[PDB]
Design a binder for this molecule. Sequence first.
Ligand SMILES: O=C(Nc1[nH]nc2cc(-c3ccc(O)cc3)ccc12)C1CC1
Length: 272
Amino acid sequence: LESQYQVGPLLGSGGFGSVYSGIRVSDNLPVAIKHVEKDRISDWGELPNGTRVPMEVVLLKKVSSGFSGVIRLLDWFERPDSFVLILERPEPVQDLFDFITERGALQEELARSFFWQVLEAVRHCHNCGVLHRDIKDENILIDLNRGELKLIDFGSGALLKDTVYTDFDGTRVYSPPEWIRYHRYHGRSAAVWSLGILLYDMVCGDIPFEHDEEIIGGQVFFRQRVSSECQHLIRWCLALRPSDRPTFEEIQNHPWMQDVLLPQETAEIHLH
Ligand SMILES: O=C(Nc1[nH]nc2cc(-c3ccc(O)cc3)ccc12)C1CC1
């Protein structure tokens, strides 16, 4: 490790863990090094070769094959009492929370581009057999030069299945009403809820629900000017009955999702 990567300062230590900035010696590639104690890992899994690792590592490996809108796992290590994860690091970079906080609600054209990229990245995960379970602004990075959104933190993920989930260790204010009322949910439909929350956030500059009475209420009030169509989609994604929510297909053929800008154009138009 220490001769191959050189550890720099500390990036964050919110939900993901203790993540530091690194530079890989061989080619000066920017990376992010995440450490995790073994004592604090609540959730284990096995690799293809049947090694016992953190689920995070398991899920990361599955999604890291191929180019996608997901930060890729490049390497990883086991130590006596921790595991170390080497990850991509865009530069310059900023998460979607800070972006929104600095700049207010995003214009619709921008939100569309971003939201699409999120959608696309999430479909990738599902195709790969992985359910993120913690989709939110804090877990989305923006390469500010390329206009590319990347998805992060598989610390609450799970293998994607078509049966019910009884556990959930994600974000409460992003969690759907089926979890609030019944501590039961299915992956995709839950995932769609969070994208409704996410979309709202982008266009309103804030999440729509603070409390549970609000969540299970299923009334969206818009604090900002949002087009009639974008509201329609948001309200659809946040439909109380899981079965009444759209599918990823249905979302991306929604009128509001049409004529998306390229990532590059988005950068030129909204980031430079
Ligand atoms: O997010 C920033 N830099 C970063 N670059 N790459 C990261 C990967 C991760 C990361 C952490 C856990 C995981 O399962 C997958 C990816 C976190 C942060 C990363 C910051 C604050 C501006």
